[PDB]
Amino acid sequence: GLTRREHDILAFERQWWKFAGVKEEAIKELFSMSATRYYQVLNALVDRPEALAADPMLVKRLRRLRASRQK
Amino acid sequence: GLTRREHDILAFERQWWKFAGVKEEAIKELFSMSATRYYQVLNALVDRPEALAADPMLVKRLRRLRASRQKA
């Protein structure tokens, strides 16, 4: 039943899912922490003005993603 | 005012944020469709019975990621 393009979308999408699988591992091995605690730290850090100075483009978009899940 | 771990966390996060950008561009060049219409097709496709059968874990995470994105 799956069309060719439906087959290709799923296969393409899955590759981004296996990326999520490496990031979890990379967090565990790079900083020696759970993925959950990593995002708790990222949460707190994003609102610090010092983080904004460091990478202005990145934390502006992290802030926008934050504000769209609540508002 | 940033510690070493905090600067590294932000650099590490920058790489994955750059990945999401490349995914959008890949959506537009490969499938020649806008990102929003891609997720329309993708999300309508999860409800299709043959998609659940062909791959259990992908749609199950995709089903579980929109259910959570909706419940609150």
**Which of B3, B4, B6 to probe by mutation at the A interface, max A CB count within 10 Å?**
B6
B67 and B41 belong to one structural domain: yes
- C-alpha separations of A65 from A11, A55, A58 in Å: 26, 16, 11
Deposited resolution, Å: 2.4
Chain B CB within 8 Å of residue A61 CB: yes
Domain count, chain A: 2
Tell me, what amino acid is at A47?
D
- Which residues does chain A have within 8 Å of residue B55's beta carbon, measured at their own beta carbons? 10, 14
Q: How many CB pairs under 8 A join A and B?
A: 74
List the determination method: X-ray
Phi and psi at A3, nearest 5°, equal -70, 170
Q: Which of B13, B12, B2, B4 is nearest to A50 (CA)?
A: B2
Q: Which of B51, B66, B70, B8 is nearest to A51 (CA)?
A: B8
A25 and A40 belong to one structural domain: no
A38 and A28 belong to one structural domain: no
CB count in 10 Å sphere of residue B57: 9
